[PDB]
Amino acid sequence: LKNHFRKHWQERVKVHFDQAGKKVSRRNARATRAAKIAPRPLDLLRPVVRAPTVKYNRKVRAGRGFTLAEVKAAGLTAAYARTIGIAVDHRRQNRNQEIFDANVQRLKEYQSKIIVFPRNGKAPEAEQVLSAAATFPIAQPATDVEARAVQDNGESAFRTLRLARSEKKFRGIREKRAREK
Amino acid sequence: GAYKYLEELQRKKQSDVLRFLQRVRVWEYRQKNVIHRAARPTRPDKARRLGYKAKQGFVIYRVRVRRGNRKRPVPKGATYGKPTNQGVNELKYQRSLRATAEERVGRRAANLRVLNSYWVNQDSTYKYFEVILVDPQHKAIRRDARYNWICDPVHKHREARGLTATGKKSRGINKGHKFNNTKAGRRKTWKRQNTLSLWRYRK
Amino acid sequence: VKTGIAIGLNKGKKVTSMTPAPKISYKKGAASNRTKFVRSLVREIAGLSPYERRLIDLIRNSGEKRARKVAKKRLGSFTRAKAKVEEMNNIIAASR
Amino acid sequence: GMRYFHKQQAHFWKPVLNLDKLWTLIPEDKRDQYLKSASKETAPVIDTLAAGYGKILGKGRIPNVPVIVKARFVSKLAEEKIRAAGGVVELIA
Amino acid sequence: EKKERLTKEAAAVAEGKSKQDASPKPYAVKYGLNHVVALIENKKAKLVLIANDVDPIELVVFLPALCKKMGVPYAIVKGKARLGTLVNQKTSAVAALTEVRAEDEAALAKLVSTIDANFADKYDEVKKHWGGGILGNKAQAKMDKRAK
RNA sequence: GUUCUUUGUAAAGUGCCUUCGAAGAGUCGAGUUGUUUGGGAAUGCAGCUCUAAGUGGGUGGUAAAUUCCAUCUAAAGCUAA
RNA sequence: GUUUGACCUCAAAUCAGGUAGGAGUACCCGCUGAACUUAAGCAUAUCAAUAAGCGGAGGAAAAGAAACCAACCGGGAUUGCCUUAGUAACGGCGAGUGAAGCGGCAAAAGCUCAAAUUUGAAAUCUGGUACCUUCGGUGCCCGAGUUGUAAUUUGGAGAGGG
Fold first, then answer.
1. DSSP assignment of C9-72
2. Homologous superfamily of E1-136
3. DSSP H helix total and E strand total for chain B
4. How far apart are CA E72 and CA E42, in angstroms?
5. How many other C-beta atoms are found inside a 10 Å radius of the C-beta of residue B133?
6. In whole angstroms, what is the distance from residue A169 CA to residue C8 CA?
7. Contact E79, E51 (CB under 8 A)
8. C-alpha–C-alpha distance, residues B53 and B60, integer Å
9. CB contacts, 8 Å: C15 with chain D
10. Is there a contact between A148 and D68 if contact means CB atoms under 8 Å apart?
11. Which parts of this chain are annotated as the region Disordered (chain B)?
């Protein structure tokens, strides 16, 4: 019931005939980058991070770069990591030991799997892999086992939530009362 | 260091020593021309932090700009349209006087590139700025990789296009929920979201 | 500390903890010995501004409330007026 | 009505799952064995959040088998109906 | 002199047996503004000379108070070109001296006492007592005649 | 790949302790006018007036006062896809 | 010494060497700025932060490594697409207008100054000139420069002493 076509919309119309050709040029650019970058992946190793926004906090997700604490714990430096093929993010901070240990083991696996060539010479041929993302996939952590013993205590979670709500709602009043005391 | 003392002292503008210096220097600048070459900065600390370096190819121009609002140059203040436009002496010129001064100075000195500018003084009638410029044909700046970027041709009339700090401010280019309509370009976002995207297989 | 439920005073799922590090762009603007020395000396040189001269008279005559009001008007906000009046109180109690 | 400045539909994300289904979240392979084995010492835990469900409701009957339900929110009648079968509701965030 | 010092240093140290014993300890004036303001606040300076004529006078207005506070004997000298002469520049805007030979220690001390007595002890009051209330000669004659 | 030069005992990275840790002003910000925005007790900009601070400052989409918390570090700058 | 010079500021040269203009302007960065129309007639409004007009660039431009988003178990430069959404919100609450965070994706890249005493050595740089292996190098001579050119340091840190 609301169609926004009172302006000169016919001037500003984009039709995506260029879809297929753009896909082809994107593939060709990836191939050319691969040739120019030959022994290396085309993708930097990214960390695992937990998403924000309660709708999405259940999921774990790939991030921008590893922290400096994670990098030092792994036992190499940020600059050498950036040369080796690792993304680093100076502004991400670590408040979760699970994520910390996960990304540390990620870096350990990467270090063990890679093969670095010396600066001076030899350069043995290595048969490039194109996807560190596929080589080191993101893993959703496992919350609990499939089956378990039931244990009931009789506090009825409904009432528990109601009491939490009530104390949140009536916090300030009781504090001001105890103040007036 | 003395630049720190200079900074903290130039912050104290309503003290006796600074209002004396102001009262003298404004008279000097008003007896001089509207645009004129300054042998050295009045404010070396400000110039130093804005990017001046006391060596060859760095130039300072003092410039004067008339104060007040914008008047639309229609004959006899008549606009010949709906009455809702406004009173005519109440228009504000989105670009700042600093930008006006930068652009006039760059028009006088077209071989130079405008690096920056800073307020020095003002009167009821006039405001006074010192503009820092660079010579990209000078070899000391074509070398010296910290300033060889100004010699590339995408930095022609930065002041006219709105790439100096006053230009970025007047365009409203910063990050946040406040600068949502003008973050990558006001007209860019307008053209982007007043645009009908239609794919091959219609969605 | 969290509770492990979706509501309450401290809601959310329990993770262990980390205290990663104190960042250095948190102690910004903190007073250094050099800043203290420079600013004290520049005050000794430049002295007072006219509204500060008014404030020192009005704290002695009129009290701190008129000072806070007129300083809120000459400056922008009450938060800055409070600190300006505290500064002037300290200048008075020192020189006197 | 009243207003809401800067509304964003992630504060309000709270999809619902009635008790009637409640075993679709268990795969089919596992479902019929857990049904026949009405073991209280070993019952299948059902994580509703990972399935994409915030609250649990009680529209219909489940069998009398134990089950461990993990959810952020529930209804009184849902908790009642599960406790009847002999299932606890563990709260999560 | 730097060039001959450098070639002598290379001749003595690269082939011979010494590290910095070739060129001895030098004594000289300090002439940079920032360098001198940093020498003060460490209290290494025995004397400071400050040019009366400077473009931005705000470059130097703080220096006398700073020298007073850190306890340094300062003087205000007529001429920045006069300093540039003794330091191989066109201008200097300051000059300092923090150490001397023993032959000149006593002259330096007597000079500092002279400077104190003649400059500061004579002009210690000058933090008050504004200047610049002078008039033109025509206005002065007008005021004189109107007075008498 | 094949030689030319080993530049250098010259620069860089790393562990622990100790003292420090400078960080942009007619600027931020506030009042008013005009304009603009979905921005609503006022989103951004500009003009006039006022004009700061350093355990400080900005933001936290309902205007203020009080107590906390969270997150960034402006008023200078470069950069491919 | 009523002399002889140094500096500062301002000028002049068909002085040595270079540089700007104008065109094009599909796209790009700003400035300035209508009405027809639609709303009943119409001042708000809409057409529209459009057209015309002005200045300025490139092969892309602009933006860009947070004075960000958030309120999560926290994410993590910018740009563009799908979606968020014809939604929150605005409006003679009428005609009508109208975003953003999240999520998936494409592409992925990080950094630099000022503010710090080299002070046991302005260690820096343009030009002129003679050679050379000439998108430049070495030497030499005028000069710039201490009202601060180099190295070192940029908040993620970092410096000094040990």
1. SS-S-----------SSSS-SPPPHHHHHHHHHHHHHH---HHHHHHHHHHHHT-HHHHHHHHH
2. Ribosomal protein L30/S12 (3.30.1330.30)
3. 8, 5
4. 11
5. 23
6. 9
7. yes
8. 11
9. none
10. yes
11. 163-184
- For the record, the structure tokens of D41 come out as 């010492």
CA–CA dist B95, B104 (Å, integer): 13
B85 beta carbon < 7 A from strand G?
A: yes
Instruction: Show the tokens assigned to B102.
Output: 């930068």
In chain C, which residue's Cα lies nearest the Cα of D74?
Answer: C6
Tokens of E50: 């400050």
Phi, psi of E10 (to 5 degrees): -60, -40
C1-40 residues touching B, CB cutoff 8 A: 34, 38-39
Where in the sequence is the domain holding A112, given as residue range(s)?
A: 13-118
Nearest-CA distance E34 → chain B (Å)? 4
**Cα–Cα dist D53/E133, whole Å:** 86
d(CA B172, CA A42): 36
Set of chain A residues whose Cβ sits within 8 Å of the Cβ of C21: 69, 93
Q: How far is CA E45 from CA E27, E28, E36, E97, in A?
A: 13, 12, 8, 6
Domain boundaries B1-203, corresponding CATH code: 3.40.1120.10
- CA A46 – CA A86 distance, rounded (Å): 7
Buried b (16+ CB within 10 A) or exposed e, D67-78: bbbbbbbbbeeb
Contact C17 A98 (CB under 8 A): no
Q: Which domains does chain C carry?
A: 15-96 (1.10.10.1760)
Q: Chain-centre distance of CA E88, in angstroms?
A: 15
Asked whether the beta carbons of B114 and B158 are under 8 A apart, the reply is yes
Structure-determination approach: cryo-EM
Q: Is the pair B, C in contact (3+ CB pairs within 8 Å)?
A: yes
First vs last C-alpha separation in chain D: 31
3-state secondary structure of B117: strand
Q: Is A21 on the interface with B (CB under 8 A)?
A: no
DSSP letter assigned to residue E76: E
Query: How far D11 CA sits from the closest chain C CA (Å)?
Result: 12
Give chains near B: 3+ CB pairs under 8 A: A, C, E
Q: How far is the CA of E18 from the C1' of G140 (A)?
A: 31
- Count other Cβ atoms within 10 Å, centred on residue C69: 14
Q: Rounded distance, CA A31 to CA A130, Å?
A: 10
Smallest CA–CA distance from D75 into chain A, residue: A158
- How far apart, in whole angstroms, are the C-alpha atoms of residue E124 and residue E67? 13
Quote the tokens at residue A74.
């792994």
User: What CA–CA distance (Å, rounded) separates E147 from E137?
Assistant: 15
By residue count, chain B amounts to 203
Nucleotide closest in space to A22 (CA vs C1'): G106
